Amino acid sequence: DEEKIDCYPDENGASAENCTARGCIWEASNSSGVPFCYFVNDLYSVSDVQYNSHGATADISLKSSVYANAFPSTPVNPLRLDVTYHKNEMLQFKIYDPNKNRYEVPVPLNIPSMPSSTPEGQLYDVLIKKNPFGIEIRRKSTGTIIWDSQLLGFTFSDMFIRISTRLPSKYLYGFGETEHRSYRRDLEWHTWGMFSRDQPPGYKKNSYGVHPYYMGLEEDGSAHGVLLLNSNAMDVTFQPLPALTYRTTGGVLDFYVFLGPTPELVTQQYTELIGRPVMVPYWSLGFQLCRYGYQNDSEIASLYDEMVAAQIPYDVQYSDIDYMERQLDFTLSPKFAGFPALINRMKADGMRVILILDPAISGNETQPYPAFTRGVEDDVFIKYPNDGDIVWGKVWPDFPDVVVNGSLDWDSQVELYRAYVAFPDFFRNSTAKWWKREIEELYNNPQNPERSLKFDGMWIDMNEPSSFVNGAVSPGCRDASLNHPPYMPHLESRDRGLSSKTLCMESQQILPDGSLVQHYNVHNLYGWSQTRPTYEAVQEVTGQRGVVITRSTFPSSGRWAGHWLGDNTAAWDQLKKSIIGMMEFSLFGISYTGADICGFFQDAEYEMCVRWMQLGAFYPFSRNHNTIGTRRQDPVSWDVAFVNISRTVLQTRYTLLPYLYTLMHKAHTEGVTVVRPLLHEFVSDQVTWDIDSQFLLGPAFLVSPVLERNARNVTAYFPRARWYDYYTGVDINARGEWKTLPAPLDHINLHVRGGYILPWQEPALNTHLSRQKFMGFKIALDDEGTAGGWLFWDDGQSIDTYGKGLYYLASFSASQNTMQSHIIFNNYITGTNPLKLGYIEIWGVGSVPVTSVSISVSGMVITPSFNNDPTTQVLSIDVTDRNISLHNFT
Numbered sequence: 001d002e003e004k005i006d007c008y009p010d011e012n013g014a015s016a017e018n019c020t021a022r023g024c025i026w027e028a029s030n031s032s033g034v035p036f037c038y039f040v041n042d043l044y045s046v047s048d049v050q051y052n053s054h055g056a057t058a059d060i061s062l063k064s065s066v067y068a069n070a071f072p073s074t075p076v077n078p079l080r081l082d083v084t085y086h087k088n089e090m091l092q093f094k095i096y097d098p099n100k101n102r103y104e105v106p107v108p109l110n111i112p113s114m115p116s117s118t119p120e121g122q123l124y125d126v127l128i129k130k131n132p133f134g135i136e137i138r139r140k141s142t143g144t145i146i147w148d149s150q151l152l153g154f155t156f157s158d159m160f161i162r163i164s165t166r167l168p169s170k171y172l173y174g175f176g177e178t179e180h181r182s183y184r185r186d187l188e189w190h191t192w193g194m195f196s197r198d199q200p201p202g203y204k205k206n207s208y209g210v211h212p213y214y215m216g217l218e219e220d221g222s223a224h225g226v227l228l229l230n231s232n233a234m235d236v237t238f239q240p241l242p243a244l245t246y247r248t249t250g251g252v253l254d255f256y257v258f259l260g261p262t263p264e265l266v267t268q269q270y271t272e273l274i275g276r277p278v279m280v281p282y283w284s285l286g287f288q289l290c291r292y293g294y295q296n297d298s299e300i301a302s303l304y305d306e307m308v309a310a311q312i313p314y315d316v317q318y319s320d321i322d323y324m325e326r327q328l329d330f331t332l333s334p335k336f337a338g339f340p341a342l343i344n345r346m347k348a349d350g351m352r353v354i355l356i357l358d359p360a361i362s363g364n365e366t367q368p369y370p371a372f373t374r375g376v377e378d379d380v381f382i383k384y385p386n387d388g389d390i391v392w393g394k395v396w397p398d399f400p401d402v403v404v405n406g407s408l409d410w411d412s413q414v415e416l417y418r419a420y421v422a423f424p425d426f427f428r429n430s431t432a433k434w435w436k437r438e439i440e441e442l443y444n445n446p447q448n449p450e451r452s453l454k455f456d457g458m459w460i461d462m463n464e465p466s467s468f469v470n471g472a473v474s475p476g477c478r479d480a481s482l483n484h485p486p487y488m489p490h491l492e493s494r495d496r497g498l499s500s501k502t503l504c505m506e507s508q509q510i511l512p513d514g515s516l517v518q519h520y521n522v523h524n525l526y527g528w529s530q531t532r533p534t535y536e537a538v539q540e541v542t543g544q545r546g547v548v549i550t551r552s553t554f555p556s557s558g559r560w561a562g563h564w565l566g567d568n569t570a571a572w573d574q575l576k577k578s579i580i581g582m583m584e585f586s587l588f589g590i591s592y593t594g595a596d597i598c599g600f601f602q603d604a605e606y607e608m609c610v611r612w613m614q615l616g617a618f619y620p621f622s623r624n625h626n627t628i629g630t631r632r633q634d635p636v637s638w639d640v641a642f643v644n645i646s647r648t649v650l651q652t653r654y655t656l657l658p659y660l661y662t663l664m665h666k667a668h669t670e671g672v673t674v675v676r677p678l679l680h681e682f683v684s685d686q687v688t689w690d691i692d693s694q695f696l697l698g699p700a701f702l703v704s705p706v707l708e709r710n711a712r713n714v715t716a717y718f719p720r721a722r723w724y725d726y727y728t729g730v731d732i733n734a735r736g737e738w739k740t741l742p743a744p745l746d747h748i749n750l751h752v753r754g755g756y757i758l759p760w761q762e763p764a765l766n767t768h769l770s771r772q773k774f775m776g777f778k779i780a781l782d783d784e785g786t787a788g789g790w791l792f793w794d795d796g797q798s799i800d801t802y803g804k805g806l807y808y809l810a811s812f813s814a815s816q817n818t819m820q821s822h823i824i825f826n827n828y829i830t831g832t833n834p835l836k837l838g839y840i841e842i843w844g845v846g847s848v849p850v851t852s853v854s855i856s857v858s859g860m861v862i863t864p865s866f867n868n869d870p871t872t873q874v875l876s877i878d879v880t881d882r883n884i885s886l887h888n889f890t
């Protein structure tokens with residue numbers, strides 16, 4: 001019943017007779033999922049298999065065209081397969097057309113100069129099996145088979161490619177941006193669309209980015225990863241005979257396989273290929289506020305003052321498109337003048353500001369508008385292929401004189417008001433200068449130095465590329481590269497073709513080299529194409545490292561940006577989904593992510609929002625954002641009870657920051673994960689393979705959120721190790737056990753894994769005041785493991801600090817009743833530049849209050865006063881009275 005490989009996934013025309021017309025068998029079923037049409041025999045035949053020291057290659061040919069000609073596109077013949085043993089832990093196999101040169105995804109990866117696999121170290125082996133044509137990847141370690149495409153269905157036609165594989169288990173994690181219902185994916189007959197579209201998160205709905213990458217767990221605790229470097233419109237299909245099926249619409253099958261043995265190891269190797277996450281500015285680790293519909297310039301300032309009055313910490317203040325004049329890029333609303341004043345005032349207190357940008361530029365404007373005009377001069381806009389005019393979409397920008405009724409039909413609004421806009425082609429060496437310029441002159445206004453906005457980071461959005469008309473504008477598109485492209489993957493609005501909510505597929509773009517591409521192949525690449533330049537733009541203009549949040553992603557996208565999970569709604573299910581989203585994104589190679597706290601779409605409710613601020617207080621990207629007409633949902637818009645709660649939890653986060661920052665350093669340097677599923681640190685425990693309603697920050701910080709309304713308690717899992725409550729210092733004392741811990745409406749549960757030391761620092765009102773206060777230690781000893789730890793210090797904003805010069809790297813270790821410090825490299829904390837070392841806490845020291853050594857060394861040796869409770873292992877040791885800094889301490 002499984003093993004049935006759906007022969008008719010087509011949008012239209014599945015029928016007994018139409019089914020027979022391919023080499024296929026029609027047989028109804030009463031079981032949900034099973035394909036009425038299925039494969040009984042193959043249509044390609046592998047021929048000249050050959051192996052060598054460094055790879056393998058066979059040839060694939062039709063047999064015969066009688067049936068291959070019967071489905072989607074004109075099949076390609078013959079094909080060719082090249083497997084390559086890059087490293088011992090990594091593979092690639094590609095199936096392509098050796099004759100014609102097919103579209104291949106233009107995103108740089110790093111690969112050993114030549115194949116560096118060694119017969120003794122190589123951890124996997126491959127076999128090109130012959131009947132029917134198959135590919136079998138195996139972990140040499142223990143025979144588990146990683147990939148096995150010796151199933152039927154393999155097709156390969158210009159605009160339709162199918163390949164399948166048995167999964168080595170019933171546990172698979174993560175696919176290209178959408179709203180999964182659990183971390184581990186179902187397998188019980190589910191298809192998923194993958195294609196950049198402006199879709200609020202939804203079940204089986206294709207969303208902002210595309211990520212054809214998964215991690216599979218094996219029989220034993222072993223793990224592997226698989227990437228399909230294809231950017232065409234595709235959908236994947238999970239069958240209960242553990243096995244999935246790709247159906248792309250026309251690249252080549254370029255697969256890369258990774259078999260680090262562990263989840264982290266896998267990710268380290270995936271990111272090693274596509275690139276590791278961007279290092280973020282220390283200030284971005286703080287809390288963030290925004291909304292769609294900040295009315296007046298001053299309604300923001302009103303908010304920023306209300307927030308410092310409540311003493312709720314936060315470093316980043318935004319403004320949505322409201323600050324633009326009629327949603328035009330690079331313009332300042334009348335209603336928002338002396339907004340430039342607000343920026344400068346806030347940053348002066350130590351805050352920072354992030355501004356949104358859309359990609360589409362309006363060209364129906366009457367006044368002068370350099371952005372658009374110089375756009376046309378430098379020729380940076382996306383046109384049709386036969387020289388044809390700009391491909392005109394519509395988005396946010398309003399027409400010039402039109403008077404706007406905020407309440408009109410959303411459709412009516414799009415014809416009467418919204419201007420025609422052009423989409424820049426961000427591949428082009430030209431579009432880079434143009435874009436980078438506009439950004440320059442936003443920062444330093446050539447004409448009105450008083451109207452300069454001094455932003456610190458950019459939020460590129462609406463870049464799928466999203467558009468509020470299907471394709472182009474007035475007459476439409478004209479093409480079959482667009483609608484019904486032989487196979488229309490299982491996307492949202494399938495009936496609308498690929499055109500739906502974006503550019504015409506025939507739209508011409510130009511790659512950096514200079515060759516011509518149509519939007520059809522690079523659509524999923526669009527937002528990605530825009531990411532690096534924007535990143536660079538911010539860097540050049542601000543002279544600092546800065547940060548970029550983008551909506552549309554693609555593998556490697558996270559190399560220059562972070563990501564927020566998009567248009568959630570203020571509903572309870574959406575909290576848990578954010579935990580997933582984050583987790584999945586760590587896999588996808590993007591460390592800096594989160595959801596819109598309290599919920600974008602719709603009005604926030606009180607209790608849900610107390611719970612969400614507590615959860616979100618631990619997103620790496622912690623931002624409270626919100627759609628237009630809704631009521632405001634920020635912390636100082638509820639009541640005294642709320643405010644006070646918000647304060648406490650935010651404080652906690654501003655304490656973890658030195659830890660959260662080093663994680664970010666380690667993910668950037670090592671490939672490791674930041675938001676990390678328990679199962680990454682405790683694989684041998686199968687209970688964790690399924691838990692997705694709680695998560696880790698790094699290895700030692702266990703977050704256990706309350707995700708249900710009335711609930712004021714929670715049941716959370718606690719793997720086999722010591723879990724110290726972060727607040728009290730006491731070990732919970734569960735071990736591979738489920739405990740029900742009390743969870744009052746003011747409290748969120750956090751625990752520190754025994755065997756780790758966490759560097760902390762006193763909570764300020766923003767990271768500027770914070771970095772000045774006292775540095776702490778939390779040594780979470782475990783009878784289960786003594787203690788290990790890391791700290792990395794930086795000016796927190798300079799470009800490539802680690803990579804060239806000024807940083808501080810210290811590993812910490814506690815063997816016997818004593819913690820010792822080893823500075824690996826120091827170059828920013830010097831005698832003159834001191835790091836105040838405040839307190840030193842130690843949890844789990846013993847019920848016997850007897851020390852053999854109570855005094856700390858700096859070179860000299862003091863025996864400062866301490867507090868100790870025998871009941872609770874805590875051993876506190878204040879030191880706010882010494883000249884102790886991280887650079888002279890031992």
Ligand SMILES: C[C@H]1O[C@H](O[C@H]2[C@H](O)[C@@H](O)[C@@H](O[C@H]3[C@H](O)[C@@H](O)[C@@H](O)O[C@@H]3CO)O[C@@H]2CO)[C@H](O)[C@@H](O)[C@@H]1N[C@H]1C=C(CO)[C@@H](O)[C@H](O)[C@H]1O
Pocket residue numbers: 198199200291292320321356461462466566567569601627628
């Ligand atoms: C702010 C948001 O506006 C537009 O969102 C539209 C969505 O495209 C559609 O999904 C559509 O229906 C959704 C409903 O609005 C919503 O109530 C939900 O419950 O389900 C519906 C899905 O069927 O209507 C939406 C109109 O509001 C736009 O497409 C979307 O991309 C916009 N979000 C971005 C815009 C802003 C402002 O620049 C940013 O603040 C957001 O973060 C962006 O994500």
